[PDB]
Amino acid sequence: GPQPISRLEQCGINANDVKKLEEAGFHTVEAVAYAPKKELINIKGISEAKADKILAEAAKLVQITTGSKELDKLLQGGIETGSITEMFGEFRTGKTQICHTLAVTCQLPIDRGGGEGKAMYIDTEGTFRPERLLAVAERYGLSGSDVLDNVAYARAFNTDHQTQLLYQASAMMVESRYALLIVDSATALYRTDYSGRGELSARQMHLARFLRMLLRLADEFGVAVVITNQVVGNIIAHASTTRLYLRKGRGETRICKIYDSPCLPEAEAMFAINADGVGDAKD
Template sequence: MASKKLRRTGVSADLCERLKRHQVETCQDVLSVTPVELMRLGGLSYPAALELLRLVSKACSPTVRTALDLWRKKGELCFSTSLPVLDRLLQGGLPRGALTEVTGPSGCGKTQFCIMLSVLATLPKSMGGLDSGVIYIDTESAFSAERLIEMAQARFPEFFSVKERLLEMASRVHLFRELTCQDVLNRKEFDTSLPGNLMHRSNLLGQEAAVLKYLSQEFCIPVVLTNQITTHVGEKVHCPQRNQADVSTEEDSGFVTAALGNTWSHCVNTRLIVQYEDTERRQIIIAKSPVAPFAVLSYTVQREGIRLEGNENPESSFIYGTDPGLQPIRLRTGFIYNLSQATPSSC
């Protein structure tokens, strides 16, 4: 909230321009100076400087809400995934005004899940959508417009049988890609063994998370992120759920954790883990949520996107009382992934 621009707080355009000349552009900039300094920088009287501080403080402070208000409006604070069992567990769907992370090995359906959510967000509210646009930031060039169209037509054939609706849906998904050399350099990995790099990376992650949380809360929108996995070679982790018949002795020499580490894992509000169950079926694991129990659901990736399979009696699929930090992630090849150092307890 402190990074909010002054022009969005109700401050006059003339005063914003005067303060901008002195590099005072955000709420944090204003609140970091004294009333006397504001008088000098903005050409204000002392009462006017105090009033500006009061206005800015109110604008960047989170709105006070009671638990009763949240309970009454819980239906308006969720975004349906169109997967009934998952929505029920998450008390309505993905939270709006919070960060949701989907992490797991490549090829498990993270991109498919995001494309499906993009279609859903453009739908009318009467169909469970947001009747809104989508900002899709693709850092791996994995987004497919053809897949977006195919998924929309397969999942909602009657609604998207009209070509105009299909075109309108596609026009609402705004794709951003990082394709320049400078973008690649900006995404370089940090050698955490070098002094200061770990702290620098943690600070950057914290800043990015703060911006995303501000946007999600300010506009009451869902923010969904995908996270990769990082291999730690030469380390062993004991996992009581491990099937030794599926893993060779050579594969026991390493394990992986969700990328970005503990700093990032504490920033996300909901964490979904995707993993392989077998060559066709996969699993969604609710590993972290302020409202949902730890649960495991089976799914497959079809033309219409994600489809839950074999969860008619979902209680039989749940693993209550299981530490999400010890839940292994299974690859198609039989490797076992472990998030023991990456998944914190729910805050």
């Protein structure tokens, strides 16, 4: 399991540097331990000696239904909890709609295709609609009020705030059972904030660390990690376990394709976006 980074402070790292590591997004001794010097050195106010002391002392201690049956079959029954699933597609393909649907379906009983856990929606694009969550809840006969009470929401204004919310998510996810973490327009802040060309490596490093934190949180809490990508990077490939390509069919009916999964076939399924739901295509 995890080894929360608090224990690293008893090794004699000072607590301020541990706070800087938590701000960076390292929350376990496992997390600090299996990384090279440069990760800790790149943090502001950390020299090579402090990074070597951290690594040295760290080595001492150490299926959610989509609600579309065709899509569930495409996924062999739904998202695997504990792993990151990326859905990349054009704008208006229904990524946000799928997120809203899953934010409620996660709360469904496991026998009903849920995870019996609360949902987490981190929004960067303003598209969060509690009324859509209410619609999905009424679709499955779930209490809309309890759905909104079991979904904690916060809009990230920048990449630093986007990573900082993970610090609150890790501590908050310990007290209550969650099953779904949603990050909508996850890549948008890396394009709007970091727009220059010399700063590309900085946003790539921040994204890499963010993805590693996502995988860490997935393995730590056994929750589903959902991130949304606008396709107007090869780094996500090794990190994402299931890549879904979304494209528009005219009207409100969307085509979904699987474009990489080591376990799931590359395959396609047709679905629609209905007021209640993300739901099977009904010609």
